[model samples]
Target: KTHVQLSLPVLQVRDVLVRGFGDSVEEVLSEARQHLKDGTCGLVEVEKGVLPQLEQPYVFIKRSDAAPHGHVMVELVAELEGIQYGRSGETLGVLVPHVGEIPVAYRKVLLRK
Candidate 1:
């Protein structure tokens, strides 16, 4: 009998906050980026009193010119058990625990002795 090994590319979440918005994704991302520079996870207003409460250490903008949508990705310093969003509009919140390495591609190797 022979042994086989498999290798693949995986995406590791590693304590991060990811949120997606509708048409206004870019606008919301811009606002979060500005406040992220302060080195503190502050509440970013998506509307008058509605805020996307963030508790991460770093914030980033995830967008694609060819795509019609975007997301605000944040590098979290700690694991997030829960998240908070408002009813101001349509927003998608990503749960870190639910996110894990997703295999992009696969490689197979056969071991012979």
Candidate 2:
């Protein structure tokens, strides 16, 4: 007989536990995605949902080590996109073909905000 043991993942917001249970990173992500898709958990949606405020025209990553020593880094690009951008990824700025004139009632773009 063989016994497998792994740490279960738990998600918390503001120090409050919400929902979580997984033995692997893949399981965690998969379950998280499912939860988000069900509209019962989180900031991500399956199809159409609120667009997050990027506040920048690039992407970044933050890392933390177990020893409490960590670093942050940033990068710049023409624009930014979300994972919902099909297989080619979201369009960053006018990277693709832009057609039609700006709407008369248009005030500004949500991207620059």
Candidate 3:
């Protein structure tokens, strides 16, 4: 018999850019909190005036023998369509075309604070 363990990759947000005027950050956070309270997820809909852009995008990797680092210059190779945030305003699942959804760990540095 063989034994193995599976794990999901850690996606980190290096930067984020929101083009055009859409819903304010406060509004989105509030909505996300409300959705969480109601036992549902929240969606930061950006199908209209809003657009999302990422910079210095990369995925995080950890190994016991080496210090934690990111796989720099990683490309999504997909079109950014929309974004969805979690209950605590952390982690954004970016909706893309053809590639479906890509999850990124939201951080204050990712966006202007």
Candidate 4:
């Protein structure tokens, strides 16, 4: 039997930002483009001496058009433990062992076509 490798769908976004899990989370994700700077890292950090709380599931954003509607139009991405749980219009929340909680929320703007 020949083995086959499946290619998953690709997700495109204008930006992706993450912050610590706390009141700061809301502040950070709110107008996220402002809070974060260049040379930022991803949720999946691989530094040798990074803080535990600085680990996964902090707060993340995946922006497609700077701003889009949450339910008006949305999508899911990222799979953890064999689960496909992520949203497109930008955001995905989850839980991990060492890292307490991961907040993945959405931020969007309404417009007329």
Best candidate according to TM-score = 2
lDDT of each prediction vs. the true structure?
0.26, 0.23, 0.24, 0.28
As a whole number from 0 to 100, the lDDT of residue 23 in candidate 3 is: 47
TM-score of candidate 1 to 2 decimals: 0.20
In terms of lDDT, model 3 sits at 0.24
User: Which regions of candidate 1 deviate over 4 angstroms?
Assistant: 1-23, 43-113
Highest-lDDT candidate? 4
Which lDDT tens digits does candidate 2 get at residues 52-87? 321212221111111111211111122233322112
Global fold similarity of model 2 (TM-score): 0.24
Backbone clash numbers for all candidates listed? 0, 0, 0, 5
lDDT, candidate 1, at 92: 20
- Backbone clashes in model 1: 0
Over 4 Å off, model 3: 1-22, 42-113
Candidate that beats the other on lDDT, 1 or 2, i.e. the better one:
1
Clashing pairs in 2: none
Q: List the pairs of residues colliding in candidate 4.
A: 57-102, 75-88, 76-86, 77-86, 92-104
Worst 10 residues of 1 by lDDT: 61-70
The residue-level lDDT of candidate 1 at 3 comes to 25
**Model 4 lDDT on a 0 to 1 scale:** 0.28
Tens digits of per-residue lDDT, candidate 4, 1-113, equal: 12111111111121223223333333334322222222121233223433343423243333334322232222223332343334455442221122223323322322111
